Ligand binder design. Sequence first.
Ligand SMILES: CC(=O)N[C@@H]1O[C@H](CO)[C@@H](O)[C@H](O[C@@H]2O[C@H](CO)[C@@H](O[C@@H]3O[C@H](CO)[C@@H](O)[C@H](O)[C@H]3O)[C@H](O)[C@H]2O)[C@H]1O
Lengths: 237, 237
Amino acid sequence: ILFKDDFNFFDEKVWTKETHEPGWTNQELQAYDAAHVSVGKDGDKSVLILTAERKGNKIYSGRINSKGKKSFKYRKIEASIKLPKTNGGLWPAFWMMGDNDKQWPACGEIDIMEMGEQSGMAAGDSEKQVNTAIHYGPSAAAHEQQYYKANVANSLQDGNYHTYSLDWDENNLTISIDNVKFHTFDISSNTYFHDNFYILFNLAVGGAFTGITDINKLTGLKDGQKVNMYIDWVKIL
Amino acid sequence: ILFKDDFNFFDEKVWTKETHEPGWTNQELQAYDAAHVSVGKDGDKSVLILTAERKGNKIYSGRINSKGKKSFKYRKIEASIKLPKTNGGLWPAFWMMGDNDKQWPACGEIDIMEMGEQSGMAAGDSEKQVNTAIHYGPSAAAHEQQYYKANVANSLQDGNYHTYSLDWDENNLTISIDNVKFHTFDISSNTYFHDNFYILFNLAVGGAFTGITDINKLTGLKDGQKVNMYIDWVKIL
Ligand SMILES: CC(=O)N[C@@H]1O[C@H](CO)[C@@H](O)[C@H](O[C@@H]2O[C@H](CO)[C@@H](O[C@@H]3O[C@H](CO)[C@@H](O)[C@H](O)[C@H]3O)[C@H](O)[C@H]2O)[C@H]1O
């Protein structure tokens, strides 16, 4: 184990909490702030807690990253995450971007896990439908993305922690869920995935991906409701 | 050349015109019927024509396939297609499904070209943004999909014909647009892409892919409007 965070405390030497207004990316409904990121207890477990909350028409949630603090290359990254029910507009993600100063998507993006996509709600398997993706290109106008989407066998929103893994070498990005291979992206001649990448976790609320960008269609998070995303640990082997 | 249709006439030994109610697939707004498929002339060019039109709240368009009539395996297929401006909910596609009686998606699906996606309008490059994809898996519950999307250099909705190509061997599916390689899907160990596939062309109107499933939001086909998708030719080499 080269690195492990058990989230006994919020380590500011590793993580930064983000602050953005609604609409900052992907027509998202939440404001990100420091107050909706905490470390706490879930039973016997030390966990990072991202809390989505709604008061009136105002929506808050949490997002952290290890940019300029913790980045790695050609190593295995795993995180144990307990996801909320996403149906009706929640958008949790475990992902990485290039640890350099290049504007997105030139920095590179690996989406290890996201749930909450529009089509999953329409098909009635929002609890099983996972997206994994890579984004790259020298600019936004030249943005390129590869996706794989599938239902896993059983609910990942089942009140349990699940293991999300990326295996990374010169040739391949291999995503696994509870130690079962989900998909492999070929990067052997992709120039954007051979540098240091930092880690992100967030719980977005609505946005293009969920197909919900009007608070009137946000059934997934109600007035007075708080909803948590729990990360028990993250490690780099 | 194994096969070439110049569309001097509609050959019922190769092609079948499809009839479906609105919302048959993907929450699409259009009815498909035989009256909205024709063969005719675009100047000197003999063309297959798929016509989308709106009479009040009734939307009609055209869809054809060569199931049980014309299918192939490990051949290059190209088509020369002129597209309408898709912005505001039009959804043209050139694609393939396995020539067997397995229920979708166990038949396999190759989407060589589709345009008109939500994100294309949101990225203000609706004339340039193309999706390519493969769908497979034993049931609708176990639906798996790989997709690539990017903007091509030049408008594909510019009043001219463009060439859409699939190269297909036992290892690779390679989509090209105007002889520029767009994406390669690895099918080397994917069991769903090693039998005969038939061809489809269609012009859907609205649907989940467009993010417009409500006729009130459909700005791309107004009341009293008529739009044409033109295929000059298709060939298998
Ligand atoms: C690339 C992309 O985003 N979408 C795919 O492209 C094509 C062309 O744009 C879409 O039309 C596909 O939609 C899927 O097509 C299947 C075959 O037409 C549909 O399957 C059919 O479903 C009906 C109703 O349930 C059944 O009665 C038919 O037997 C079955 O073939 C499927 O529902 C639809 O999602 C995209 O895959």
